[PDB]
């Protein structure tokens, strides 16, 4: 029968100096395990050399290898499975 996506750990905001690694962390549960996708400004993000999405079972991260001021803003985590969807937004603040 299954159960809809939910957050065991919610992605809290991160404040990071320009140039430092930043990671939004969450833990998403659900049956079947939800597919989690991160978007920014309404656009789905693509993995790259500077942006990765470490996923290990329920553990999910959005990882910025070296944050830049342009990385600041609100990111949306959307989790989906057969039973439903869960949404959580988190802000990255990048300081000089």
**Dihedral angle computed from the Cα positions of residues 64, 26, 32 and 44, in that order, rounded to the nearest 10 degrees:** -40
CB of 75 to other proteins, least distance (A): 8
**Does residue 90 belong to the site contacting other proteins (CB under 8 A)?**
yes
Q: How, if at all, do strands 55-56 and 73-81 pair?
A: unpaired
**Does residue 35 belong to the site contacting other proteins (CB under 8 A)?**
no
The whole-angstrom separation of Cα 54 and Cα 61 is 5
The whole-angstrom separation of Cα 90 and Cα 57 is 21
**Which residue, 34 or 49, has its beta carbon nearer to other proteins?**
34
Determine which residue in the list 17, 55, 68, 74 makes contact with other proteins, applying CB under 8 A: 74
Give the residues lining the site for other proteins (CB under 8 A): 4-7, 10, 12-13, 42, 74-76, 78, 83-91
């Amino acid at each position: 029968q299954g159960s809809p996506p939910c957050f065991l750990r919610f992605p809290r905001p991160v404040r990071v100096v320009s140039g430092a690694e930043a990671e939004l962390k969450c833990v998403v549960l659900g049956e079947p395990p939800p597919v989690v996708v991160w978007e920014k400004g309404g656009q789905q993000l693509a993995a790259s050399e500077r942006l990765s999405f470490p996923a290990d079972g329920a553990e999910h991260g959005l990882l910025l290898t070296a944050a830049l001021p342009t990385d600041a803003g609100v990111y949306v985590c959307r989790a989906r499975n057969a039973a439903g969807e869960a949404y959580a937004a988190a802000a990255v603040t990048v300081l000089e």
